[PDB]
Subunit: 500 residues, 3 copies
């Protein structure tokens, strides 16, 4: 039960500096994030865009190559979980607060405003651009990290860490040396800022959903939502035990409430129009896939840079930062799975759920816009969902259910991430200290709250700007994780049985 | 060997008492078809569009998988036909009447009017859209149904029926039970209306051809009756005379006459422009494939719904209703082949023939539009081919040949389909009774004539409306045929 | 190996006839080239466009098939060049002069004027259209011709000749008869005119560079003669002297000066914008690949014919002319490599260089257009690189390096191609006589000069018209080489490789 204090102190110190900086110096912190956002988006936006699509190609090649047959674990090892059970668990890997936050807003803004290189009121571009940010690019990054940890821990028996995946390139001297520790420090920092963004989005949307109950104010979002969801629920469940019996119950509530919320909009909404957006979004996603993969700051005659920072480069930075958690989560539930089957399940099942989600919620909002009724309202992204729900019969009750669903994603997402952060701080130990897991949840919630407070009126922008800067160092870890992964697969397994 | 009357009577009652009484109540029939068409297109257009493209993906994955090495028959068994006879045998089946009917109009109307999401006068979109409805989506449906029948009756030795292909899902108890009969009844009803649509188009075009040749005035309802009555009688005489040499004489004449017509327009039309369209049709088809596959009733800002019901959803329903006949036809001529070579041949050979055919007739009509000439006339879809032909030297002679070519496709299509329905009503008997074969052909021509007579001015609209309604029940059989086929393929003798 | 006078003469008099016709009768030569260009583009433009993309599919389908594992050489053979070295030699047999000439002009032209079916000021279309003409279509032709030559020479032990690759179709007797001689004659003629075009572009740009550097008042007709005479003489000295140290030293300078030029523009130019165009050009290339593959004279409502004849049908003809040389060059350095390794290396490595090259020079030129500057100037295609350089600090000294780089490309392009021509006029001898190698290089320079002199104010247009006519016969040799390569490879799987 040793603690990697050399990995805790660096990653921890950076968090407190961000929390201290964003509270007493909101102006200075806001300026730096805006300034740093500009430097990263200009000088490295190509790197996010270029390597975003390299990940999709790289993981498809790996699945279709000889490496697909490799089995994550002992040869002829039965998977620990059934296929249907394994499929049902990836839903806990999904981004339930981002899907709820951007379920209506994203396809609606693309429809209302258009995207660079396209005109307004284009349904296919609206749905295809949303599927770009949510289906394959996010889950190619998670597959790469999940595959690297799965192979290292199961097929090679190495420590469950991000640095253990780099043993092929830097060996054990680097993995336990300065470079290995740096890779593990950047993984914790990325997870804190990747998770903090979702917690901040959820707190923002719950605050908008409470408009029916109370008027919104800074303290309502600041203390009430933040402290209540982080304290009464996250700490208590974690402190009581590693498996508090609440996270398993709440993980069920996330599945049940999400399905009921989708079914209510699907049934009570424009059912036929939603079913039209199923093949419409998949077809237009595949048609425009490379047209959006090649959209850079020089697209639209050079005017695409501002849009990309808000939408595409933010999502790429967000996915890159969530990779250490989602990679660890997918690795755990995929022992004994083949590489080809692991990639196919991870790539396609989450893509199918995101497609259906945005068709129901994105399609319903677009249908309203077409008919004249606009749920746009003022335009804030945190109240588009509750505008959509209030526009259907029974919306008041389901609007309350959406608030409860967000609350259970806040606790579930914090507990799932804090568990991985504890593993990285205990030399890859599967069962981590209750206090260590609690502390990482507090820090992540403190970061997500500080981003909201510092931003003020532009709370969402400060949330997005900080995530891009925090995910930049780990973009190069994922790139080097592709080279390490090929060396690992090519070195051990091939020579094991057939070649030698 | 005996007749399955539990399948004939349910199918005959729907064909006889329900539809063929569209001559007694035309106003009532048209309203139902219009109302039923709106219900299907609105509430189930997504299903046709979504699963039309899944068939293409599913069939490509089957060939690319380890299943492609399975032989359709006994292991290490050679194909019965040569790869040249086999490939030329695919030139039977086929639309034939649909290619002549829509050979000129479909690419021309898309050029004149455009398509949802695109502006008019786009040659790439006009030709890519035509290739969408005729090359891969139709022949992925046929390959699935043909592959399921070929696998069940050749490798596994089951009966040659649609229901026998569902034994993996429903078991032998189901295949002989209520569900097995329902699948066979739906297969017959789909084939009757899928073929009745082709016969209706063939009779409409022959009526337009006769007026264009000045033999008759504008064709009336009685003239259409004579065409269908005369052609069906010629079909009966061949069938009831026994095993006749006439049908193969007509099947060969279809190849020569169809090729003679395509060569004439190619050599006499804008050869260079037609040739330019061969890369243009194929390149733009692959460019827009998924853009067209993602076109739904709420594309073009909720404006593609009317267009889809007339053009895309009609074809998908038309192909799904054709699948039982073309599936059985492909199974017979593909014994001993591998799944990979069967799929690739079925997918690509018709894709190349359709691409070349529409380039000669779609391209020639579009070239006239650009130059200043125009074969649109009054906009009727049945008179465009003869407008194209009469616009070229020697057009009068070749216009007659087009009518002759349509007449032979009528008998060839009625007989080829009536043979499959006879097999479905005789527990999979290949050598079906000649009397049952003639009965199914008469009903098909009676249904086609009813759709034309009922529609009146909007004769085409009534053909397309009823076809979409008839094919909707069989859309879910083909969806289930994918699950049945995969289970069957997985549980092969080589591996369980 | 005795000289093949039955092949030299038919290919020589056609070369000699072009020189006399194009020098003493400039007016008649240009009229025939324009008339013949229209006939070829109108009646066979479909064939160039159809089969340009069939080559890409064919070569990809061969690498991914069971043939991908076949080794180019005796079984269990190892390549004599490391993968790093083998990749380095790929840069030789690249255009060099073509990249230098069209590095700035092509992407800038499409951005400013647009392409059929698209509007102006489209960076994605401008960059993808340039990638269409330089990345996969050219190198799918070179991989087909190089693979066919490599397989028949190493795996089968035939002669290092193009007609030897048709033995599966026309038998051993056929390769020695008229049909085999015809393929050899066409292969030489195609190489001479494909090489003359690159040399003609090189002398056209050098004359522009001299004027841009104020060394000379203007590039008169005699100025172009002086450039070609000086550079062709230097090529002769290297071949006659027998000292290969000179050429290998020049070949290294090409990589050093080319990389130096590219890095200078990358660093002093808009670096961030250049980096944006890397994913932007690759992504928009894969998006539009089939839209551009389907572009014919019937596109844009029947208005793309003139554009295609100038841009796409010229490049397809130009690559078909370069095929015999790049085919032999690739085969020589690709011994012991599997089919899959050869196809992947040949397709992807040169595609990577071209994407970077046009992003640096095309992207810099486009960025100047956006900001209000414009290196377009008079619109002359041979002065756009030097307009781009003089717009950057230190571009006057770097303008000289661009000219010296053009000259070294001129010397090595002539020597590299004439070596292949000498080989294929001496029964496939690996090292033919230096005198015969020098004779073919001089003949190549004479046509390049003749096309430039005959064209006059339309020198560039004359080069393209003649290149399209010369490559038309060879378009069918490459088409049939696909049917001969599959037949030859299949006989190996019977051998089981
Ligand atoms: C939740 C909403 C719906 C989601 C829908 C997605 C469903 C995905 C579920 C995937 C399950 C896990 C993946 C299982 C793959 C198995 C890998 C494997 O082992 O190879 C097999 C599978 O290989 C394949 O052929 C892959 C299937 C084709 C995949 C093509 C998918 C195309 C879809 C892309 C659409 C575009 C995506 C858009 C995203 C928005 C080969 O089978 P075999 O019979 O040889 O196996 C051996 C046998 O048992 C003897 O021992
Ligand atoms: C054919 C027009 C229909 C277009 C509509 C359908 C869209 C698909 C078009 C592209 C499909 C290519 C099919 C052939 C290649 C894949 C099949 C394979 O893997 O094995 C091939 C193995 O063959 C090879 O080794 C070479 C591969 C051929 C690669 C494709 C050829 C070109 C296809 C289209 C070119 C597009 C040109 C216009 C540009 C837009 C067998 O094909 P084949 O050689 O029998 O087909 C051609 C026949 O021989 C003609 O004589
Ligand atoms: C910035 C500096 C300026 C200059 C730029 C330099 C550009 C260099 C770019 C380098 C490109 C990499 C290509 C190198 C390939 C050499 C090795 C090779 O031939 O491929 C290997 C193999 O590599 C692979 O496996 C590649 C498989 C994936 C194919 C690549 C897919 C992406 C291609 C995208 C290109 C799209 C077109 C864009 C063109 C503009 C060989 O091994 P093998 O074929 O025996 O392996 C067998 C294996 O089972 C299957 O091949
Ligand atoms: C009007 C234009 C004409 C149409 C356009 C041209 C399209 C040509 C399509 C022909 C494709 C035929 O399909 C081709 O069949 C052969 C055998 O017959 C298959 O053959 C291959 O796979 C099968 C099974 O794995 C094996 O039996 C065989 O040994 C192997 O070579 C190919 O996998 C397939 O590519």
């Amino acid at each position: 039960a040793s603690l990697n204090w050399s990995v805790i102190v660096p990653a921890l110190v950076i968090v407190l500096a961000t929390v201290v900086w964003g509270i007493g110096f909101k102006d200075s912190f806001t300026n730096f994030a805006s300034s740093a956002l500009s430097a990263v988006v200009d000088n490295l936006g190509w790197a996010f865009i270029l390597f975003g699509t390299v990940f999709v190609f790289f993981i498809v090649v790996i699945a279709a190559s000889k490496f697909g047959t490799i089995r994550l674990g002992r040869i002829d090892e039965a998977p620990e979980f059934r296929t249907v059970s394994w499929i049902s668990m990836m839903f806990a890997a999904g981004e339930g607060i981002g899907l709820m936050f951007y379920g209506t807003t994203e396809p609606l803004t693309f429809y209302r405003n258009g995207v660079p290189g396209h005109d307004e009121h284009n349904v296919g571009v609206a749905m295809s651009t949303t599927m770009f940010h949510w289906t394959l690019h996010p889950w190619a990054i998670y597959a790469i990290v999940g595959l690297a940890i799965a192979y290292s821990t199961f097929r090679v028996g190495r420590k469950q860490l991000l640095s253990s995946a780099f043993v092929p390139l830097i060996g054990e001297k680097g993995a336990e040396g300065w470079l290995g520790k740096l890779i593990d420090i950047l993984a914790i920092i990325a997870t804190v800022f990747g998770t903090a963004c979702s917690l901040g989005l959820g707190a923002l949307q719950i605050g908008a959903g409470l408009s029916a109950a109370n008027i919104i104010e800074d303290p309502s979002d600041w203390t009430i939502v933040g402290i209540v969801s982080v304290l009464t629920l996250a700490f208590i469940f974690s402190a009581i035990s590693g498996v508090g019996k609440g996270i398993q119950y709440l993980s069920n509530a996330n599945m049940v409430l999400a399905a009921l919320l989708a079914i209510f909009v699907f049934v009570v909404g424009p059912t036929v129009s939603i079913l039209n957006l199923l093949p419409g979004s998949i077809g237009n996603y595949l048609s425009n896939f490379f047209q959006m993969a090649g959209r850079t700051a020089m697209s639209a005659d050079g005017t695409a840079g501002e849009w990309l920072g808000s939408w595409t480069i933010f999502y790429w930075a967000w996915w890159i930062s969530w990779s250490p958690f989602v990679g660890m989560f997918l690795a755990r539930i995929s022992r004994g799975r083949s590489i080809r089957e692991f990639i196919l399940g991870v790539l396609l099942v989450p893509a199918g759920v995101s497609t259906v989600w945005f068709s129901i919620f994105g399609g319903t909002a677009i249908v309203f816009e077409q008919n004249g009724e606009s749920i746009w309202g003022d335009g804030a992204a945190e109240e588009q969902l509750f505008g959509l729900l209030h526009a259907l019969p029974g919306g008041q009750i389901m609007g309350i259910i959406a608030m409860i669903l967000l609350g259970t994603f806040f606790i579930t997402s914090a507990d799932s991430a804090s568990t991985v952060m504890g593993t990285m701080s205990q030399h890859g130990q599967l069962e981590a200290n209750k206090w260590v897991t609690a502390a990482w949840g507090v820090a992540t919630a403190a970061i997500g709250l500080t981003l909201l407070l510092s931003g003020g009126d532009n709370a969402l922008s400060n949330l997005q700007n900080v995530t891009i800067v925090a995910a930049t160092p780990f973009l190069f870890v994922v790139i080097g994780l592709m080279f390490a992964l090929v060396k690992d697969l090519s070195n051990d397994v091939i020579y094991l049985e057939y070649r030698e």
